[PDB]
Amino acid sequence: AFGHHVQLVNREGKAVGFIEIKESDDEGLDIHISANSLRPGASLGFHIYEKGSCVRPDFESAGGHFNPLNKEHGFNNPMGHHAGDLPNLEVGADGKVDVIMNAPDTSLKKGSKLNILDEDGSAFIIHEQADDYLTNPSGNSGARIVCGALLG
């Protein structure tokens, strides 16, 4: 079943949705994301970050696209991509995204290099603009505008 429930908040502190995760067969992780209050009909950057910490308004604090394999950013970079690089969100007329994405190169298993429930935890962040799938170190996705932490 889906578990590991994570509340999403915006820069102003508003609850705007949740994520749940499932230990996918197979393999990697299925991510149920169900959010509101987004730019209606935008393409938006979406990634797993390396530190479970969402301090507003900016969320720099903390990190880092999740990158246990030390690669460059981008599905279409020949030197890419990071393990927490996911495909863009496609927001409805509503301002909602309600989908399930696969994250092949992640895990919940302690010990494993692909673990996102490590000591640090990890963060899911929505960006202001699209990931261009190519530029270092975050696809030119702009400001981090929603955040949720999974605690480690």
If the CB atoms of residues 26 and 119 are measured against its own copies, the closer one turns out to be 119
34 binds Zn ion (CB under 5 A): yes
- Residues contributing to the annotated binding site for Zn(2+): 32, 98
To the nearest whole angstrom, how small is the minimum distance from the Cβ of residue 15 to Cu ion?
Answer: 13
Interactions with Zn ion, residue window 52-71 (CB under 5 A) = 65
34 binds, among its own copies, Cu ion, Zn ion, none (CB under 5 to 8 A by kind): Zn ion
- Over its C-alpha atoms, the chain yields an Rg (Å, rounded) of 14
What backbone phi and psi angles, to 5 degrees, belong to 109? -85, 125
What are the structure tokens assigned to 11, written together?
């820069």
Distance, in Å, from the CA atom of 141 to the CA atom of 36, rounded to the nearest integer, reads 19
Find the farthest-apart pair of alpha carbons in the chain and give their distance in angstroms, rounded.
Answer: 42
Q: For binding to its own copies (CB under 8 A), which residues are involved?
A: 7, 9, 12-16, 40-41, 43, 50-56, 58, 60-64, 67, 69-70, 76, 87-88, 90, 93, 120, 129-133, 136-140, 143, 149, 151
Element (H, E) at 44: strand 43-44
